């Protein structure tokens, strides 16, 4: 991933992998892997920020170690009505929701700066494996997607 | 800032401001439009005078 790029990632567990050094053209994992891509709250957008921009980021309390150097991973599901917020602007560092026009700041832990969304985008902790692969270091702190009655402690 | 007296004058004197009770209020108007009422009828003329000069 080059600096100022965004990529959608999905929760691929260890035993559903078929690619890599140990690939047998016999194992069938397509049906399982389709479950992760089709999960309501599974999609996560992984942003690599420029090194100049990563020094201007303000982290939320309790989510300061959730980044790997220049990689930040936010939940892709909008905190308004659960549309996928995927319009990542490379220079303004805002993520725009196509559905209703919410702008989430990428340098302010996903805090909205326009539109009907009121709560910031949840952040996923990430790290790198011993083999050299990007992995999830933990679960989200908070429920994903739109709000509901009995949501926020 | 000239616009201020001008706008106030036009707005105020449109509704209020002295009634003209004469055909030609400037006195010595010398063109056909000073031969009608102020304002003129819909069709500009309730009569025409004899035109012999400018």
């Amino acid at each position: 991933l080059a600096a100022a790029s965004m990529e959608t990632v999905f929760p691929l567990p260890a035993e559903m992998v078929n690619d890599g050094a140990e690939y047998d053209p016999a194992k069938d994992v397509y049906e399982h892997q389709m479950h992760s891509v089709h999960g309501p709250r599974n999609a996560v957008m992984l942003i690599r920020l420029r090194t100049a921009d990563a020094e201007k980021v303000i982290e939320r309390e309790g989510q300061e170690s959730f980044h790997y150097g220049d990689y930040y991973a936010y939940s892709k599901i909008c905190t308004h009505i659960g549309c996928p917020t995927s319009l990542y602007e490379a220079q303004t560092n805002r993520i725009l929701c196509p559905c209703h026009q919410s702008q989430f700041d990428a340098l302010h832990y996903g805090k909205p700066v326009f539109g009907p969304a009121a709560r910031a985008l949840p952040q996923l902790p990430i790290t790198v494996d011993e083999e050299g692969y990007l992995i999830a270091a933990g679960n989200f702190i908070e429920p994903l997607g739109p709000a509901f009655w009995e949501r926020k402690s | 800032l000239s616009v201020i007296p001008f706008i106030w004058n036009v707005f105020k004197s449109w509704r209020y401001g002295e009634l003209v009770t004469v055909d030609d209020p400037w006195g010595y108007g010398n063109s056909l439009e000073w031969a009608t009422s102020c304002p003129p009828p819909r069709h500009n003329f309730a009569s025409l005078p004899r035109i012999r000069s400018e």
Binding site: - | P5, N9, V10, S13, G17, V20, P25, W26, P39, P40
Partner: protein, 54 residues
């Protein structure tokens, strides 16, 4: 002055030109237009504009 090329070499596309066509535009289209408004206001409306404000 602008109509002579020896003089218009230095004066073209300067603020001397800007000053010129504001004496002629603001001259005709503003002074004479306002004159026309004060002149014809009784004719157009049947009322007279304030002299002091004018």
């Amino acid at each position: 002055m602008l109509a002579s090329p020896p003089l218009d070499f230095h004066l073209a596309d300067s603020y001397f030109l800007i000053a010129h066509f504001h004496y002629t535009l603001f001259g005709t289209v503003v002074f004479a237009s306002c004159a026309g408004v004060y002149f014809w206001f009784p004719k157009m409306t049947g009322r007279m504009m304030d002299e002091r404000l004018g």
